Design a protein around this ligand. Structure first.
Ligand code: SF4
Lengths: 159, 467, 92, 164, 100, 270
């Protein structure tokens, strides 16, 4: 029937873990898309910001708290990898200790990038981390012929 | 029936006092002042005494099916009002030393006066219940007034659980009677099947807690030691004076009380009340427990008259005059106890060993305690003797030989502890409203002496009131 | 009838719960001051008389309105008393 | 009718037995709520239509809520468990059980002596209690309002707040 | 078709059980609980007596009986408040002074 | 994309199903299970008193109002056994303050409803729905109508806004320790609560089953839909009121308003 899949595609509950910086664009997105998000109730955790070595156990307890269906979005270069801070005090990515499903590059990403993250995550949630033999297709490979066909761009001396 | 101006003039005691609660509550919320609240509360109770004359202009009549107003109820309302007047004048000197919230006291006493003057007027079993509980809630709460001590709260809690228990016995009995009879009106009741009698015995349990009878007397020591002496003035006099009127009216009106099945049970309770009071009362060295022990015996003498209410018409005035004499004796004695605690003093140290001397400390106040303490016993030149004399005459009239013998031997046993306290005030020594408190007990001393030597005018009032 | 609807409701509760299972010392200053709720416990008992009153008022008439005004005036006096003494105020 | 009355009366009896045998308070409060709902069912079966629904709104919806508040704020769960169960043995339960059973059998023997004269479930509507409260029984209502004011002031007093 | 005896013995059973709960336990909360139970038992007995005769005499004091229950429970609960504020022990044997 | 507003609630209900349940350690189990249905079944059976049709009436009982008040009083137990079952002083105090403002603001609905049932004079809902035949019982009782509105939106309908958060520190909202189907049970319970308050408002204040030119059941349904939309509009417009201001505008302002409301209706009815 796949009614459960429709249920999971249609509705998701976001847990906002944005840190010191990089959260003002996330707020810009959230105030347009949407006090409903609550701890120990959500199934989606959008890890953003620089994952520091000191507070990483906090992220591991919050990962443990959520329910059986767990999705994780890494946003920003500081959360996908160590980003620009390849330093003793930053762990080189949140994917080291928790599995991650979607990666959103940028520094900071755009609100539209958050929108496209929800679109790619409902697209992944709608094919049953399971590849379902459909995720080998990559945005690097899917829009490749779209991006290569671009020839001319506006000159940067104009507004 | 509807409301007629005759009904409002008849209801004037229950009205003036209720208007006083509202004005006192508004005055508390306005200023929260002790002087204004005491003045406002005593003015309302004095206004209730004045309005007793106006209901005397009205005859013997009904207000609702719940109540019947007779001249009998006129006298009982008066007894309750002077006790309320007596307790506020004894509370001001005790509460001047209280640390805070000194103003809720008069509000609760005013509620208890409403409850007392509602059990005077009774004709239906429900008014009996609206009255018992209206007076208990201030007596639930006023023995726990000044809960900062370790025993006031103790006394409040013991009285609280037990009084709710008695009210639950009274209510369950009140319905088990109404199962047989079609109405709960006293007159309409009884119109000797075991369920009606069984329901009657349950009401005796629920009534004999508050009247301090023999298997229910256990509360009367403890709360009398724990409560403040101003509360003990009201708890000794007003509550049982008001309660005794409704239990007498039920047996006078109800034809079931004519039957000997209930009569034998109440006589045995009266027999044992005298004995189980006057034997355990000897060993006490505390004045408050001593007065609480005597209360059980005094309510027993009232019962040996009440059992012969149905034989001869002299029992009506006999119960009335012993209640008047019993009021004056206990108010004078408990006023002296409270007048020794002229400040709050935390826990008052009163005992029979603490009352050595007291004549070379305060001679006038020792004389009042001696006069009243001899009046409790049965010594002549005191109003207690005339009250004792009528209950002996009532028992002789109805041929209750065991009961009248119990009063005499109970008097013989109970003479002992009254006399020790009378002589212990003669061993070797170890503000404006205070003078007003002294005036109240001194006024009562003059009254009990002149109505013991010259008792006719009080009888004229009683036969004027009795229907 | 009402019984059938009650059976349906309890059957739906049983169905959802069964389906869910198969699918698979010292407070100090904190709390206290519930006395607003004690005021409700007493005031619900006061308002139960108005609950019984509301059914039959047309045959009651003028003395009924008079003594109902007295009743709610006594309640209002008690309320302003509680306000002015400081019982009914800001509460944790 | 008879079977419904029997089953709800037995539910009330079982809840009353349950509330007097357990130790944890919240279970006792829950079973007492169940007993009160059963009593309201009895009231509706008898025909006291303004009693079964009057008990729940007030007796099982405000006062029991006050009980829940006081048992919740004391936080007495998790402390003082063992000695209460140690003292409350069956042997001391038998003691006053027979003493109350004498009262029970005496009142059963008293009530079985009368005739039955059974009454059907006559429905009493609120239209007539709206008159009877206002007929002879107006001063009962007034003195009950004064009673409730008295309860309010004694609850404010003996529950006095302070700095702590 | 139920006669008076069944309802009256039901009220008597609740009366007896409430009285026993008032007697046997130590906690003042539990004596207040048994007190309210036994008040309800007496009120039930009154209600079945009132509805026996088939007029409006059962609902006229039952309302005031539950008013008494409300006021008594409220003052008792405030007493428990101030008792636990004074002393941490909630047993009745703490307030057991002036024995004899 | 989804074209219907209700489809979101449908997807939410489907989502709450089939979610793994974890046992809480150091917690009571009977109340942890029973607290949701005290909030759900109460307002589910509050639906049993609506006159949806004279011929398809769900229950033709003589009294429905007292049942509604019985559910109103019962509702508090859900927040209280939830607070005690949280077994965390933070959540327990959060549910204690939520139940505080609940018991505080549940007082008004009965006394506000006394006015309409007094000018109606009966408890059988057929008499009320037949009373609003030409003149509705909303013109004289504006104050009663707004008081009943405030009371209906104040019973754990999120207008107080102290349910999932706490203005006071040292404590936390009590919706944290529930994460299974019980959270969906809470949402569906408040949903049936708001629709039942709207239905009771239309059938008790305004005129149900009128049918001016169209069949009256869809007239009732469309009026209920308009009041649903207006309730959502004012709920969204209503900002979060802090705990203090809610305590200030509670027993002070609307108890006298409903008492003078009873005085006015009793004076004008005779
Ligand atoms: S991605 Fe950029 S904005 Fe975001 S935390 Fe890292 S450095 Fe800051």
């Amino acid at each position: 029937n796949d009614m459960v899949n429709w249920g999971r595609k249609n509705s998701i509950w976001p847990y906002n873990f944005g840190l010191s910086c990089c959260y003002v664009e996330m707020v810009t997105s959230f105030t347009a898309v949407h006090l409903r998000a609550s701890p120990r109730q959500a199934d989606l955790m959008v890890v953003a910001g620089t994952c520091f070595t000191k507070m990483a156990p906090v992220i591991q307890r919050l990962y443990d708290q959520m329910l059986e269906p767990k999705w994780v979005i890494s946003m920003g270069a500081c959360a996908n990898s160590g980003g620009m801070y390849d330093i003793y005090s930053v762990v080189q990515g949140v994917d080291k200790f928790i599995p991650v499903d979607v990666y959103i590059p940028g520094c900071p990403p755009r609100p539209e990038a958050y929108m496209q993250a929800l679109m790619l995550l409902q697209e992944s949630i709608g094919k049953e981390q399971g590849v379902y033999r459909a995720n080998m297709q990559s945005e690097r490979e899917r829009k490749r012929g779209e991006r290569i066909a671009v020839t001319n761009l506006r000159t940067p001396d104009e507004i | 029936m509807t409301i007629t101006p005759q009904n409002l003039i008849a209801l004037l005691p229950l009205l003036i006092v209720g208007l006083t609660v509202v004005v006192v509550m508004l005055s508390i919320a306005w200023r929260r002042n002790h002087f204004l609240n005491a003045t406002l509360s005593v003015i309302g109770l004095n206004a209730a005494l004045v309005s007793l004359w106006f209901v005397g202009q009205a005859g013997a009549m009904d207000v609702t099916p719940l109540m019947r107003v007779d001249g009998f109820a006129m006298l009982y309302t008066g007894l309750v009002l002077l006790a309320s007047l007596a307790t506020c004048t004894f509370a001001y000197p005790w509460l001047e030393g209280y640390n805070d919230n000194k103003d809720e006291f008069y509000l609760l006493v005013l509620i208890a006066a409403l409850g007392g003057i509602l059990l005077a007027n009774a004709n239906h079993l429900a008014s009996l219940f609206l009255g018992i509980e209206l007076i208990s809630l201030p007596l639930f709460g006023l023995v726990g007034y000044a809960f900062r001590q370790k025993r006031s709260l103790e006394a409040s809690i013991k009285y609280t659980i037990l009084s709710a228990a008695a009210s639950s016995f009274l209510l369950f009995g009140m319905a088990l009677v109404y199962a047989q009879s079609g109405d709960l009106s006293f007159v309409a009741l009884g119109k000797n099947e075991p369920l009606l009698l069984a329901g009657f015995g349950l009401m005796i349990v629920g009534l004999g807690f508050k009247l301090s009878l023999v298997p229910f007397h256990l509360w009367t020591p403890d709360v009398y030691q724990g409560a403040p002496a101003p509360v003990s003035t009201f708890l000794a006099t007003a509550s049982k004076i008001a309660i005794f009127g409704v239990v007498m009216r039920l047996f006078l009106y109800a034809p079931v009380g004519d039957s000997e099945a209930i009569r034998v049970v109440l006589a045995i309770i009266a027999f044992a009340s005298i004995i189980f009071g006057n034997l355990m009362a000897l060993s006490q060295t505390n004045i408050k427990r001593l007065l609480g022990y005597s209360s059980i015996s005094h309510l027993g003498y009232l019962l040996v008259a009440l059992i012969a209410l149905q034989t001869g018409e002299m029992s009506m005035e006999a119960v009335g005059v012993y209640l008047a004499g019993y009021l004056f004796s206990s108010l004078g004695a408990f006023g002296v106890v409270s007048l020794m605690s002229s400040p709050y003093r935390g826990p008052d140290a009163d005992s029979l060993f603490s009352y050595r001397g007291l004549f070379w400390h305060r001679p006038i106040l020792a004389a009042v305690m001696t006069v009243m303490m001899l009046s409790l016993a049965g010594i002549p030149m005191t109003l207690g003797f005339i009250g004792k004399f009528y209950v002996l005459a009532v028992g002789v009239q109805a041929h209750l030989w065991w009961l009248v013998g119990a009063v005499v031997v109970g008097s013989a046993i109970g003479l002992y502890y009254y006399l020790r306290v009378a002589v212990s005030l003669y061993l070797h020594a170890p503000n404006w409203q205070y003078s007003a408190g002294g005036i109240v007990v001194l006024i009562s001393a003059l009254l009990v002496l002149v109505l013991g030597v010259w008792p006719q005018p009080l009888i004229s009032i009683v036969r004027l009131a009795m229907p | 009838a009402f019984a059938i609807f009650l059976i349906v409701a309890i059957g739906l509760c049983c169905l959802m719960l069964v389906g869910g299972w198969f699918l698979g010392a010292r407070l100090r200053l904190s709390a206290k001051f519930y006395l607003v709720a004690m005021f409700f416990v007493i005031f619900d008992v006061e308002a139960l008389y108005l609950f019984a009153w509301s059914t039959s008022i047309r045959e009651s008439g003028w003395v009924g309105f008079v003594e109902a005004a007295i009743f709610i005036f006594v309640l209002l006096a008690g309320l302003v008393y509680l306000v002015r003494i400081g019982a009914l105020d800001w509460t944790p | 009718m008879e079977f419904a009355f029997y089953i709800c009366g037995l539910i009330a009896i079982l809840a009353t037995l349950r509330v007097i045998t357990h130790t944890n308070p919240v279970h006792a409060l829950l079973y007492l709520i169940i007993s009160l709902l059963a009593i309201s069912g009895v009231f509706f079966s008898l025909g006291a239509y303004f009693a079964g629904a009057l008990e729940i709104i007030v007796y099982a919806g405000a006062i029991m809520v006050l009980f829940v508040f006081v048992v919740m704020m004391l936080n007495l769960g998790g402390s003082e468990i063992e000695q209460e169960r140690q003292w409350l043995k069956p042997q001391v339960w038998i003691g006053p059980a027979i003493l109350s059973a004498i009262m029970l059998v005496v009142i059963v023997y008293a009530i079985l002596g009368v005739n039955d004269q059974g009454i059907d479930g006559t429905p009493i509507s609120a239209k007539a209690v709206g008159i009877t409260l206002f007929g002879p029984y107006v001063l009962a209502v007034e003195l009950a309002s004064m009673l409730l004011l008295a309860g309010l002031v004694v609850a404010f007093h003996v529950g006095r707040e302070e700095r702590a | 078709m139920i006669p008076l005896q069944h309802g009256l013995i039901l009220a008597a059973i609740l009366f007896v059980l409430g009285l026993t709960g008032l007697v046997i336990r130590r906690n003042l909360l539990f004596m207040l609980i048994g007190l309210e139970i036994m008040i309800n038992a007496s009120a039930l007995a009154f209600v079945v007596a009132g509805s026996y005769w088939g007029q409006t005499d059962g609902q006229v004091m039952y309302i005031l009986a539950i008013s008494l229950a409300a006021a008594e429970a409220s003052i008792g609960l405030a007493l428990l408040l101030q008792l636990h504020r004074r002393r941490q022990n909630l047993n009745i044997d703490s307030v057991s002074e002036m024995r004899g | 994309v989804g074209w219907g507003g209700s489809l979101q609630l449908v997807a939410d209900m489907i989502k709450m199903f089939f979610k793994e349940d974890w046992i809480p350690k150091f917690s009571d189990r009977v109340i942890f299970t029973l607290a949701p249905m005290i909030a759900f079944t109460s307002l589910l059976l509050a639906f049993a008193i609506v006159p949806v049709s004279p011929g398809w009436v769900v229950a033709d009982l003589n009294i429905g109002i007292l049942f509604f008040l019985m559910m109103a009083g019962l509702a508090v137990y859900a927040v209280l056994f939830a607070g005690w079952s949280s077994n965390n002083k933070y959540s327990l105090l959060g549910a204690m303050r939520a139940s505080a403002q609940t018991l505080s603001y549940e007082v008004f609905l009965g006394l506000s409803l006394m006015g309409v049932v007094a000018q109606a004079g009966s408890f059988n809902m057929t008499d009320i729905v037949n009373s609003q035949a030409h003149v509705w019982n909303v013109i004289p009782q504006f104050f009663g109508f707004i008081t009943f509105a405030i009371a209906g939106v104040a019973v754990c309908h999120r207008h107080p806004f102290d349910q999932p958060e706490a203005e006071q520190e040292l404590a936390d909202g009590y919706h944290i320790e529930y994460s299974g189907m019980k959270f969906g049970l809470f949402f569906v319970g408040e949903y049936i609560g708001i629709v039942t308050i709207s239905a009771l408002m239309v059938t008790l204040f305004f005129g149900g089953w009128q049918g001016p030119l169209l069949p009256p059941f869809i007239w009732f349904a469309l009026k209920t839909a308009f009041f649903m939309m207006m309730f959502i509009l004012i709920r969204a417009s209503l900002p979060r009121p802090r705990y203090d201001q809610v305590m200030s505008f509670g027993w002070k302002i609307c108890l006298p308003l409903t008492l003078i409301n009873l005085l006015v209706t009793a004076a004008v009815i005779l």
